[model samples]
Target chain A: NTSENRAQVAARQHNRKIVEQYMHTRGEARLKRHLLFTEDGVGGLWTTDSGQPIAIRGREKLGEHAVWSLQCFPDWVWTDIQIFETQDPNWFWVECRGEGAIVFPGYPRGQYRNHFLHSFRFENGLIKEQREFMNPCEQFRSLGIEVPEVRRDGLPS
Target chain B: ENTSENRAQVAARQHNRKIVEQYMHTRGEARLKRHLLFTEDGVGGLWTTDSGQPIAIRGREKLGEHAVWSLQCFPDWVWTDIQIFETQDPNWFWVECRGEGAIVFPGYPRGQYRNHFLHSFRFENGLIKEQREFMNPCEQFRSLGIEVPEVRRDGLPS
Candidate 1:
């Protein structure tokens, strides 16, 4: 039919459905009933109705961590968030720039900025694992973060 | 941003270079050269400036009968009469869909077309290593001359 309507409809529907699915897994129902809690106040490590753990592990802490810490997890700031779809159903294909404002007992200083690629996997309905991959050099350059005067090869500061 | 066509060409060229370089190393320079017989005729193996000259062999021929790259192994290359290409680089911060067509092997007997998605990749040194993927195996079904099930059977309307 050469009309853009069908393509637009498909894209819209895909986006809506995916967002709804995201909410279903991480939103109202999750907070109200299914997902349990971890001792560290991070995502819970528990199972869902389908016997799947809600606390799953994801590789690359950039996107998911940013979203969680900012939107769901609390106490974080996130920007430049983007999501990409891939063949794998278990993992989220996403990227983002973010920061976590964690206050340490010894030194409560400024916030830390992070940028990353976020890949995730889910079991049943929950995340069971988490992994993080980072490139400080690339990230610092992109985010304009000031790095200490230390070379990657462990030279002078 | 460049036009969709430009991006597609870039992606295609990158993909082609990747295939050639990988095949050259994995299958050896000689056998790699031979496989090109299907595409470019009378072309010897890929040459290296270093060291000395050696007889180039083709990978597809020396390996076995089905020692060629196709939909199954490459996955992305599977398509109907229509071929697909990347409309843009995936890192450009948006969901993308691209489709293109061209005869890869002009000299080959089979009139095969490649349609593929620009599935994401994990690259090291700008070379793909861990490719999380999706590829249509439907082309093989077509190649096998299998017919798609008719959906109009036993329907209420004629």
Candidate 2:
């Protein structure tokens, strides 16, 4: 039983590596099709910390967004990453720190760095839902973007 | 120059990896305290989202309160599926993981809630100087038969 348990742990560790590599490949703009999913898997859904829906279409669109966001800052790169598996074999939590230059029209190309935590839920070996948690104000401020004042109602107006 | 920088990054990443592995394999209150490096330094914060609002417990005093209160709910709480991130600065790292265990309280069935946590750590000479955490409470509330309220018009949810 001890051996079996060790095997399971080793398998899970290898799985974590695969998932991390998949993400890195996409980050490098190497994988273009369904980077977030396996074959026969539908797609991925993304949401923000404030519960705002980000992507609903599928993995292609999610990959597009990932590529597009990274393209915003040509030198954008994730410096550090940690990944953990959840109770379910298909789910993983990832923590990452990314640094880049400001690319928005008004914001100068200043060095920017921020942290993010994301939960990835998989179905049939593909990521189906991903939730992100981070303070938007900190993320925006890192890029020299002035965060608008938020009303008590959770709306930035 | 690139080789020197790359080596530094790899060392930091390996350091972060080791710390997270150490934290995940430890269990129970005594183990938890040791894993948090509570004895050497009284520096840690527990940030919780309860009732759809943020709550902060800063310092060892409040963190002790958090440990006791949470242990009351799940005596066997343990972390798993850990991921670590080393920042470019090497002094800071981030962790994301899942926690799962049984909830044993009077009138509450032997229930369980699987939750997620994100923590940030700052290091001083290889020892943790500060630790900050955020945990999702939605699953915990559901297991305890509580409703998570939404933000009210006048102010945020309590």
Candidate 3:
């Protein structure tokens, strides 16, 4: 009963569906309506969502991330969804395409495209921790403002 | 419901999973020695800085350079925990890890920082052809005592 049995496999599959559905919902409905995100939940590594210091972690900051995202790319769309199955039933990792344009100024006001990887850790069927991985260079380039000092060879200047 | 190729794929997934696990646990020269890290000479290699001002590196030479220099970036950068996630496809593996350490960089103070990152790899026959990282550049620099404006200077147009 303790090992990964039939029911556990099914449970893992169910969790993946929940995450996928949440991903879809965030694109349309408000993130708060997703039935996830408990008070202790924390999300990070999403500079595009919120540009604050990385040291900031908590459920509240996760909310700010959503706000920044909504303001910039109200038309945001996610496609090319690819998800993973892990031994940890609570783990949900996905690689997908993100597309949208910045409606606000600080970013280049044009269509932007890139790939992203998101991993969520769930506890008691509610999201506990979420992490986003993406090509920020591609995003910043598509957005116009770039680090002028950047080079492939990041030698000390 | 299961067929020959399905069984083969299942075995392939298992094999690939082990390779990724092995690579993650192994570090430095031992890691590269096993040859599970990437494609030959980096034909399909990819490594991007998980930063705002990101640096993209390809080819075995550059990947090697990054692995070396970043180690030199934070001498005490020790991995606290590494968790690998497997996928149905044989070629993809995702790793999440966090560490507590101090880093030394030019213009930055030697200070305590946390290393939390996700490394997503695309494998070619169980070797990494591409490895991408997801991280917060703003936080990353902040952890090293490199001061950055809380908000981006460019977020507001002139």
Candidate 4:
């Protein structure tokens, strides 16, 4: 276990704030501004352990995924168990849960809850890379639905 | 902009780390009876598997039984490459590790198995409360060249 200096703690705090705001920030355009982009594009993956992992890149692609989620659970929001302060100032880890109601017929059409982890690498306080880990079986059981084929992985995305 | 020297946080991290070390490193039933095994009176934990529903174990007696069940199958289950990520809050820790042991499953060649683990924990009243393991039994079974349906039956493969 490594210790964080006052300076390092300060840098971690700065990065943590961006994530807190990004989770709450409404709309794709505003959220996109919080992500880091490069010649290749935003570097990350939006992975679910039981489902096909989709590349978490670019404003349009991510927004499309978010749109798909929004279509299913329009009021979706996240709450974290803790946003960890790490030895590396740029890498941020969060253990969080999320909830929303399912309006889409493909879902169980009720309140849905999820537990997952988020890891972000900040490029000057903007997200350069990101990974999310979710356990859908837990969610489905909560809904009284059978656990089905999920699109997530066990390893960190 | 809230910042401090983190005196309490550091102590919390140390205390929590000791608990994990004592719990995971202990090799036998003594392991279960020692350090944070509130399961003697009963502790609550969640086990989720792929292709099946989640099983919630409550109380010391039942939890003890569950741990025994796992130890019986693996017999030599020990976590390797263990990495515990401490949060600013000492009560919370995240673990990523590889666990390997000889399997007791039927028709498994060599009967040896290994799997990845991504686990989450929270300490409540100095005991692990609501710890969640984030691994799929189906995936682990597939690694052993076995299909996942075994897990879907009775919530365990063995």
Candidate 5:
């Protein structure tokens, strides 16, 4: 396999590892590193994967606030690993199964499942930022959409 | 203002507009062509303002899906003013408020504000091989335990 292929395989495995650590064992530190534990109000501040900070709060006059927050997702299992698009260097796409028990504060305990889309950026050997898209199961309750049965195996289509 | 502060202030200003033009413009492809977009193995993708090469995907990794969730509550859409950041040399970052009419996924309704942020990578030989990150405000709002409207299968054009 070419290097790109190898990296794709490695990326999938890495994401899977994170899923295991996060879903099975309550990966708090990893979550914090990715989405929390910011020196300021913003956590998981995006920077050059090489470690250059993104000016998330450069403007004080504006109402922009920089902060980071997150929670552990218990029983989360990721599957349907897919690499959607490839725009040279570091602009690929991944569509996967984001499942498990999501524990948010308050309603912080239940089986929440959803199909997630994540777009990530990397540099200097580290993942700096990620844009994740998903339709959570709980959203049906508010949208008046029918509640989806928890798919014991796959994501809801 | 001192030279450094003044430079930073200028960067921030330009950074904001850059984000708006790249993602919020009517001709997104045209704007996208203006820069280089890239993707890494662990990191997904974003674009570099410096010649816009190797644009990688980012601008939402920060808040962890909270910001988007909050915007889901609003009926009308709004966006924040644009902001910019210079990742120093060989690197770049930019952000803009996701205002109403700002397209998240084409054909989908816009959100209440511009909470999205985008990052780019530095490329070698016009090819971005490593290093860059991006995020959105939804991740932040989610961290705050807020709820947002549900989004599905919507993405920008290629």
Candidate 6:
């Protein structure tokens, strides 16, 4: 009776650990360690709180962006995971309410917090697709920065 | 051993589902009351949509008022595909739902519309302390041929 549920539960817990470790990591080395993607299989979808799209594709570009963002807050940048769930064996969703301070010169130094929901799908023991939803406007506004308009594909015109 | 884990997961899922059902399907004043955990200070919620700004609703009384106003626009509004999850904090959880229906009193021929919503609820003793919802209300209004200027322009009488 319990065995069937046990396996599924174990899988979800394992996935949870990977997700938590990935989100809580503070540096590029740790970020890349948990990232499971190939050049052709890498993909990401990002949207802001106000429905502005920030979609991007390509593994190398994605990795480069991730590394750059991590480097920006070398001192500290982490997500506080509020919830993580598995709707299917291969897919999991996470709800995060995070707080961090950006120390980069061009950016403000004050603290910031925002709510985010992310979905990840895995294939062959690696993450192949990720969808992220958060309010960058809230983040930028908190830092006293003006936001730029973008097209539907999440690119500046 | 494993039975305990199975039972725990099932109970959590059921508890989370009940909260969402009360929020989505319950009607009348009782419906609102069933979901909210009323305190002397009441509760708070922050909402954001695609085109408009963020709107914060304070107090249970005001939240009910907003609900009444919404029912006037879409009395038949109903949501589907509801999924619930438990947060790290036992007191908090979230739900994802999709809603679709037509307006009650309307001029636009294409009166029907659809919208997706995500809500995070903080609960204490089986009652909600706070709720936060994110969706694109501007898209909903635009679908009905209405152009709202601000996020607060939900047409709810103050």
Best by DockQ: 3
C-alpha positional error of residue A43 in candidate 3 after TM-score superposition, expressed in Å: 6.4
Tell me how each candidate scores on DockQ against the true complex. 0.02, 0.04, 0.22, 0.16, 0.03, 0.09
Candidate 1 local accuracy as lDDT?
Answer: 0.33
lDDT of each: 0.33, 0.56, 0.63, 0.59, 0.36, 0.57
TM-score of 5: 0.31
Better model by TM-score: candidate 2 vs candidate 3: 3
lDDT of 2 at A116: 56
Q: B47-157 in candidate 6: lDDT tens per residue?
A: 654322555566666666666555566657777898776544555666778877776444455477776777777665555667887765445555656543321112111
TM-score for the second chain in candidate 1? 0.29
Instruction: Give per-model TM-scores.
Output: 0.31, 0.47, 0.67, 0.66, 0.31, 0.62
- lDDT string for model 4 (B1-158, tens) is 23455776676678877777666566766645543445344344435456444556666566666666655655777778887777767877777677777766434544667666676666766677655666545455554555333111121111
Q: Compose the digit string of candidate 3's lDDT tens values, residues B15-109.
A: 77777677666654553354436676543223445343334566666566566556666565556588787766677778888765666666656
Question: What's every prediction's RMSD, in angstroms?
Answer: 19.9, 12.1, 5.9, 8.4, 17.4, 9.8
DockQ of 1: 0.02
- Report the lDDT tens digits of candidate 1 across residue range A60-132: 3223333333333234444566555433343344455655553332232345554444433444434433323
Q: Which stretches of model 1 miss by more than 4 angstroms?
A: A1-74, A123-130, A135-157, B1-158
The local lDDT score (0 to 100) that residue A2 gets in candidate 3 is 44
Compose the digit string of candidate 5's lDDT tens values, residues A4-79: 7778666655544443333232333433343321222221223122122333321221112211222335444567
lDDT of 2 by residue, A3-94 (tens): 86676566556556656765575345643635556433343323123333344356655555555555555676665787766434556767
Report how far off residue B31 is in candidate 3 (Å): 5.6
User: Where is the poorest 10-residue window by lDDT in model 1 chain B?
Assistant: B149-158
Model 2 superposed RMSD (Cα) = 12.1
What is candidate 2's CA lDDT for residue A121?
Answer: 59
